[PDB]
Amino acid sequence: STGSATTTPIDSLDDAYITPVQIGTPAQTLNLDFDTGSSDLWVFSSETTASEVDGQTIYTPSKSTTAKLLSGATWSISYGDGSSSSGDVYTDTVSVGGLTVTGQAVESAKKVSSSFTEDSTIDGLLGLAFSTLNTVSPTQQKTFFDNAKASLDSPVFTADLGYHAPGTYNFGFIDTTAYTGSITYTAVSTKQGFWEWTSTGYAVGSGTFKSTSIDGIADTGTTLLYLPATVVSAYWAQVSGAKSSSSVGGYVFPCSATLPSFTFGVGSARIVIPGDYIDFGPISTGSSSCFGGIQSSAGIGINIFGDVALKAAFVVFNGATTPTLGFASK
Numbered sequence: 001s002t003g004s005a006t007t008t009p010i011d012s013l014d015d016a017y018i019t020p021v022q023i024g025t026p027a028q029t030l031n032l033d034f035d036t037g038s039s040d041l042w043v044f045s046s047e048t049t050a051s052e053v054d055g056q057t058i059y060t061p062s063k064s065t066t067a068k069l070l071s072g073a074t075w076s077i078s079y080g081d082g083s084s085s086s087g088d089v090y091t092d093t094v095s096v097g098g099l100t101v102t103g104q105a106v107e108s109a110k111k112v113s114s115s116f117t118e119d120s121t122i123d124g125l126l127g128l129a130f131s132t133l134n135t136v137s138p139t140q141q142k143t144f145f146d147n148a149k150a151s152l153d154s155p156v157f158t159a160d161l162g163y164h165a166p167g168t169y170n171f172g173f174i175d176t177t178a179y180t181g182s183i184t185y186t187a188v189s190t191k192q193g194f195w196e197w198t199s200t201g202y203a204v205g206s207g208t209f210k211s212t213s214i215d216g217i218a219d220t221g222t223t224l225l226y227l228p229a230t231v232v233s234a235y236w237a238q239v240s241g242a243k244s245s246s247s248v249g250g251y252v253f254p255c256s257a258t259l260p261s262f263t264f265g266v267g268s269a270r271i272v273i274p275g276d277y278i279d280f281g282p283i284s285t286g287s288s289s290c291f292g293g294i295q296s297s298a299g300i301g302i303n304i305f306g307d308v309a310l311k312a313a314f315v316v317f318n319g320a321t322t323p324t325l326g327f328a329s330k
């Protein structure tokens, strides 16, 4: 079997992408943030503290005839940006774009951090990293992808994120009409539970390509591109007036500047990120300082190929017994 679902940016800056997911019987449709950087499927629910819900669509297990409480199971997660949530666990039927999994662990939030409450358009997250990172205790739970793997035509899913436009998540098949050229595959390390790979180098604008190994994770759940300080300094040095601002928390640039493209290596292939993708707009309403889409990973401890990089490519997440990542131009 296969599944295919449209994913849509939540705002004009592509800060995140939401994808409709059907949960329960009869179906309750929630718009979830597909996150290859985490491994929990959690949702706003009828159990969430009412003061922490502001416009989100909630999952109501009491209205689903297939929902079963997972006795004694709890979950608690903290994200690298300081976000967090926690609650109890149900199992239920979950469908994504025609692909159905029965007995999927649906983690019901009792408490969410303020950043989720203020994001009215995200009803929850659907984790797509490896199941070793799932936070359910005392019995760890499998991701949607892991539960679907056996029934998929091919044990893959693909991410085709749009720039200021809708995109597609496909499960079980590779749409050979969605990309140009060939797909370049590269090795994945699962030792930390992430889709972790090694980029072969970078170039700024039309400059010389610098061959150098950059270890990082492919993370649809992170907006920006977080790279080592040396790389990020070399990029912003080519933007007149750009500087690192401690008060803002990263590199900013005059909104009137034109940004150079950024190229990253995948084996012998090259993925080019257009300069317009790196513009994240004024730091505050009316400001003439704009926030940059490429920032330093020095404070994070790991390099993150977030949406800024992934939306420049067609990305294959190959969940075979030896997992690999595929990149193609589009």
Ligand SMILES: NCc1ccc(C(F)(F)F)cc1
Pocket (backbone or CB within 6 Å): 035, 036, 037, 038, 079, 080, 081, 219, 220, 221, 222, 300, 302, 304
């Ligand atoms: N998108 C989930 C996520 C959040 C944080 C991290 C970090 F910062 F720990 F690397 C990885 C993945």
Ligand SMILES: NCc1ccc(C(F)(F)F)cc1
Pocket (backbone or CB within 6 Å): 016, 033, 035, 037, 038, 079, 080, 081, 083, 115, 116, 119, 122, 221, 222
């Ligand atoms: N990387 C996972 C993640 C995704 C979204 C959010 C936000 F923006 F909703 F708070 C936080 C953390």
